[PDB]
Design a binder for these strands. Sequence first.
DNA 1: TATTATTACC
Length: 103
Amino acid sequence: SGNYSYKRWVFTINNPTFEDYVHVLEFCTLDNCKFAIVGEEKGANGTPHLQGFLNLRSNARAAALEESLGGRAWLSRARGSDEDNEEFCAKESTYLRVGEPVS
DNA sequence: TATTATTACC
Ligand SMILES: [Ca+2]
Ligand SMILES: [Ca+2]
Ligand SMILES: [Mn+2]
């Protein structure tokens, strides 16, 4: 993963499988996260997807985070604030939330 | 980065 290692990440999982949901539920806990929010969403195409943000307690490299989330996620370092992500990932009103946004 | 996709924060 080179030096691409962060605590704060965005992720998307398109067409989540049952196993994707299990990995996300098992990982998005206070053990691992200061704050996490994951919304179940559909865009204009109607493709169901998980829309997620993680503020992790420890740095993760992409390969490790990929494994933790089930292996099918698009990942990138977060550029907005925790609150920006809390609003964005809650916008379709079917979501899981762990912890509180960190300023 | 790793990865499935038009979804992806600022
Ligand atoms: Ca970080
Ligand atoms: Ca499955
Ligand atoms: Mn979305």
